[PDB]
């Protein structure tokens, strides 16, 4: 019916109006202090005043670090942008890692714009061009004007088209009897389909039949758009959307990432500030999430030191599970969580704690509830004891083979024999390591 994958039993942080976390609500069990700190961070993000704040989630493996970031993303809502990253994604072969980090920084700042469009639309009834005096004169096009007759509901208009508009008109392969849509902001033309006023069953090109557009031919409408700053940066960097030669050739070449200079970013910031001052724009800062932060090296950390001190950069959430580890790209420095101390000085560390037997048991119970399985109480106790003995994730991932083995025996509940058979068929890390130690030829 539905697809579940290691998550989606979590719907939020699960707090009341005072910020006090319940013991079990919202799909979360335990970790009260971390959830309250994440609620404070959520309120700070919703305040929309700060810039360049950062927190770090530190804890052991399998303790709920990525779960808290996904709970923050669910508590914020879909309107606030959220860019999840892994630390290995910043190394690209097309552009340096500094530009990729700045791109992901600019990808987490949203914007909402009320946009006004001048629209000519209707049904094409007359398509008549007229010619130039000397078509082989070398300079100037072949034709001079194109007369287009458009008919909408309760209206009819005639237009004398520029040839440059007619290139986009004839690139869409319009004809007499087609409903078109001309956008005067960019010159883009959309061919909607054949009109339904004529016959239907005499076509061979699986076309779509559309009634006449309501209202007049010439229109003005207001459109609310959601746009990030990185979208404006890559739109101005590779210009596609005009009707000129360069904008036409921009759509045909193979795209490649380029080092966008800071001058373009200053110009985009100036235009966005003008749009905000005009009262048609609203700025929505977001969250950038970098999981497995220990994969970064010293150069990206040193650039991140500068990039957090700008006046645009969003809230950055990191995560790591290292105790005292040398930073990558260095030889002999040793720093907590693989994060250098100059970056550590600008953070706010949120500690995460391991679980107990009862918390493991109720987590197993809720994840068996989500996966639509029925578990007996003795099998649940055995699964909780296994989770304490080996791993929480190993007891989590043994539920579905137990369900398959129960279903092959024509049963609905999960009993102790299925758990024992899944133990015997499937191994964990410790038993595999113990087998590898007592092995013959590097098993």
């Amino acid at each position: 019916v539905t697809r579940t994958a290691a998550h989606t039993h979590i719907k939020g942080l699960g707090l009341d109006e005072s910020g006090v976390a319940k013991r079990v609500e919202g799909g979360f069990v335990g970790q009260i202090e971390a959830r309250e700190a994440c609620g404070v961070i959520v309120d700070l993000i919703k305040a929309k005043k700060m810039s360049g704040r950062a927190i770090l989630l530190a804890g052991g493996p399998s303790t709920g670090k990525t779960a808290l970031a996904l709970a923050i993303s669910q508590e914020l809502g879909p309107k606030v942008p959220f860019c999840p990253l892994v630390g290995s994604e910043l190394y690209s072969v097309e552009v340096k890692k500094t530009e990729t980090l700045m791109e992901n920084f600019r990808r987490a700042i949203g914007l909402r714009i009320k946009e006004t469009k001048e629209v000519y639309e209707g049904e094409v009834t007359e398509l008549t061009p007229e010619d130039a005096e000397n078509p082989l004169g070398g300079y100037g096009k072949t034709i001079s004007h194109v007369i287009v007759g458009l008919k909408s509901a309760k209206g009819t208009k005639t237009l004398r088209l520029d040839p440059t508009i007619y290139e986009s008109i004839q690139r869409e392969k319009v004809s007499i009897g087609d409903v078109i849509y001309i956008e005067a902001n960019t010159g883009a033309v959309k061919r909607v389909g054949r009109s339904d006023a004529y016959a239907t069953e005499f076509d061979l090109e699986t076309e779509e039949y559309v009634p006449l557009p309501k209202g007049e031919v010439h229109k003005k409408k207001e459109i609310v758009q959601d746009v990030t700053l990185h979208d404006l940066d890559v739109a101005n960097a590779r210009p596609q959307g005009g009707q000129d030669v360069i904008s036409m050739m921009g759509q045909l070449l193979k795209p490649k990432k380029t080092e966008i200079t800071e001058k373009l970013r200053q110009e985009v910031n100036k235009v966005v500030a003008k749009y905000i001052d005009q009262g048609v724009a609203e700025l929505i800062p977001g969250v950038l999430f970098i999981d497995e932060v220990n994969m970064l090296d010293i150069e990206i950390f040193t650039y991140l030191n500068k990039a957090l001190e700008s006046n645009i950069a969003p809230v950055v959430v990191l995560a790591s599970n290292r105790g005292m580890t040398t930073v990558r790209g260095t030889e002999d420095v040793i720093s907590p969580h693989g994060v250098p101390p100059d970056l550590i000085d600008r953070l706010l560390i949120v500690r995460t704690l391991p679980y107990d037997k009862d918390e493991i048991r109720t987590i197993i119970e809720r994840r068996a509830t989500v996966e639509r399985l029925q578990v007996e109480s003795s099998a649940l106790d055995l699964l909780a004891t296994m989770g304490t003995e080996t791993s929480l994730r190993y007891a989590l991932q043994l539920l579905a083979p137990c369900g398959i083995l129960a279903q092959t025996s024509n049963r609905k509940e999960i009993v102790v024999n299925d758990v024992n058979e899944a133990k015997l068929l499937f191994l964990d890390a410790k038993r595999s390591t113990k087998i590898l130690e007592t092995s013959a030829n590097y098993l």
Binding site: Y181, V192, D196, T200, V210
Partner: protein, 68 residues
């Protein structure tokens, strides 16, 4: 991208189930009346019928006395 018609039909569950029932009702070859309460609830339903190219006529409060 222009507003689609199939989406106009799938975002409303009542209209979707009405389409599913009307497919077998038209396959049976029948005659059917539908009652409404809003102006636009039948104005959009006329658009659904013209998408389905079904034969239909409309009677409401705005109709003149001769048309009835």
């Amino acid at each position: 991208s222009m507003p689609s018609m199939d989406r106009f039909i799938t975002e409303s569950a009542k209209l979707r189930k009405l389409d599913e029932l009307l497919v077998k009702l038209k396959s049976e070859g029948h005659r059917v009346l539908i009652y409404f309460q809003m102006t636009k609830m039948m104005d959009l339903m006329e658009e659904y019928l013209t998408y389905r190219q079904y034969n239909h006529i409309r009677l409401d409060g705005s109709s003149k006395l001769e048309d009835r």
